[PDB]
């Protein structure tokens, strides 16, 4: 009889997952467009959790479940509104808007402060918090209703089946995300034949608002069927944290999730700054190749735990095994890397021959000297030598071909290598793409990501199964609830934040905002991005592994 409820919940789970990706696939765009640092784009990303942590508290004191289906419905409806709200800042903000050649010819010749636009991110941040306030009722209350209507061995298995179908969402999310990150932000408003920036450039902000509008409409449509369907605490918390093992595990999980959440939030920016790949490719490769294998990994983990008869002391050893395997593959990321992009004036002297300690305050070279011009304009042009430059004026170029589609500057004062004197010094817009070898290494990156995430998923269910055998039977609901709350809150709100702070400390060139304020990051120090990204994710992981080993030792003792 209750097939209706299951269908509806599946729609909702598909909707929930679609929502989460639409947020993490638009990070590279929202950040790029509202012009905020990586830290805030982490804050905005976390606000979703921030809302989740809010709704929890409000129900805990002065709230409770009542008529589950209508509640799930109002939750999904609020999630959809929130998606629509998050898309809304685009319709009342304005158009998302340097080719100046050398001006040796001419030499020695308030509103921005009051920029509400500067706190316009506060809109998206709110919308995401709405989404968080609305999503929370889905999972726990849906599982409660299931367990209310379930025969022997049904509610839990139902979680499994629903989780499987949910994996159809990330597939569409990334697929749609790959489609809308190729469409310029003002698509339909501006004639797309004049926009010079390309999807590979670092100023390209794709249609994120389409992502959010589609996610919101899907969420509302999935909220529709839920209507017309049905017709002390602290004391235990004390105990749950009194059990040393539980504490070890929650800490163990928190460490890994923070390594997962940071990596997910900034994987698109890492793909783009290390290898030359845009966001559209990354999105679709994660959606077509990685997600089916991730679902296969989750299924295989469940089956391995269900068939091989792995007990408590054994399930922990198996999950640790998955981790050693995942970490091994992750630690391989450090051998499939790529040299730094030589951005004259940022990683080297302007003459392109001497490398310097600081990106900041690099003295102008003869070539980039008399040509006085801005020093905060990121209009990158790469020359025949293959070294990126900052701006056509900072490269000392004199003449331009014109607004014709291929814009090739000439007579550039820099690029004064003596080996190409007979050759020209033309430099076309954009940065120059990385050598083929790096594009090749991108595929090793995708393969290592696939294998890592497969071995990660292999231990997915094991986490829930363990969090229930490490704790006394009468504390389970509270123990798993506190686990989920700690993981979501801490990992979700803090990890996108400090990962972005450290990625910020790796940034080389920032862009002026409306009124003289660090805006967004135009180019990064790839190698440092790695040591701060791949590095913080590895230590968090290694530390998780280290505690597991300790946990296994202890479990091997407690039961023996
Ligand atoms: C780029 O430099 C070339 C070579 O100097 C310029 O071509 C010469 O321009 C000047 C003035 O017209 C004269 O030397 C000759 O008429 C041109 N022939 C050459 C090769 O000497 C060219 O005009 C410059 N283009 C700009 C404005 O960037
Ligand atoms: C598998 C996933 C899509 C992308 C995933 C990912 C991708 C790269 C990544 O970092 S990477 O260095 O391993 O590539 C971390 C993660 C963490 C989990 C994250 C999602 C969970 C649900 C989902 O559909
Ligand atoms: C330099 O540019 C000229 C056009 O001005 C082009 O004909 C030439 O092939 C380029 N390089 C060489 C080999 O001189």
Residue numbers in the entry: 26 to 122, 138 to 149, 160 to 281, 324 to 652
Lines quoted from the article behind this entry:
OATP1B1, encoded by SLCO1B1 and formerly known as SLC21A6, LST-1, OATP-C, or OATP2, is specifically expressed on the basolateral membrane of hepatocytes. OATP1B1 plays a vital role in mediating the uptake of endogenous compounds such as bile acids, bilirubin, steroid conjugates, and thyroid hormones, as well as a large variety of clinical drugs including statins, antibiotics, antivirals, and anticancer medications for hepatic clearance. The overall architecture of OATP1B1 is composed of the transmembrane domain (TMD) and extracellular loops (ELs) with both N- and C-terminal ends situated in the cytoplasm. The interface between NTD and CTD of OATP1B1 forms a conserved cavity in which substrates bind.
